[PDB]
């Protein structure tokens, strides 16, 4: 029991350290990769629309 309590306090310390100083940077990395993928999708969509508009203009001319 005593060693269980001590180990549980140690695990609480570990979790506090992880959430305080490890979760933020890794969460930021995940957000950065997600935003990179979303921006790539937006680039694809806007480039497709740009090609459509250019084709329409060329057909007009």
């Amino acid at each position: 029991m005593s060693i269980f309590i001590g180990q549980l306090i140690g695990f609480a310390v570990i979790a506090f350290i992880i959430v305080k100083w490890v979760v933020p940077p890794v969460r930021t990395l995940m957000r950065n990769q997600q935003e990179a993928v979303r921006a790539a999708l937006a680039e694809s969509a806007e480039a497709a629309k740009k090609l459509a508009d250019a084709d329409a203009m060329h057909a007009k001319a």
């Binding site: 993928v37 790539a40 999708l41 680039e43 694809s44 480039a47 497709a48 740009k50 090609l51 508009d53 250019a54 084709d55 203009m57 060329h58 007009k60 001319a61």
Partner: protein
Amino acid sequence: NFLIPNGTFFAVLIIFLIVLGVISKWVVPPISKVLAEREAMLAKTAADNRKSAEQVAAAQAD
């Protein structure tokens, strides 16, 4: 003693094998397809930008 191999050696192996199977059939092929599609999408975006750039000039020329 603890360094002597046991029958567990087989059991663990079996588990590993099935995990590998899953990873071989439902993780790596889908992920490879996703990565390849993303790369092809980036290449297609670049190609579409290039075609738009040349067409906006060709239409004015013609």
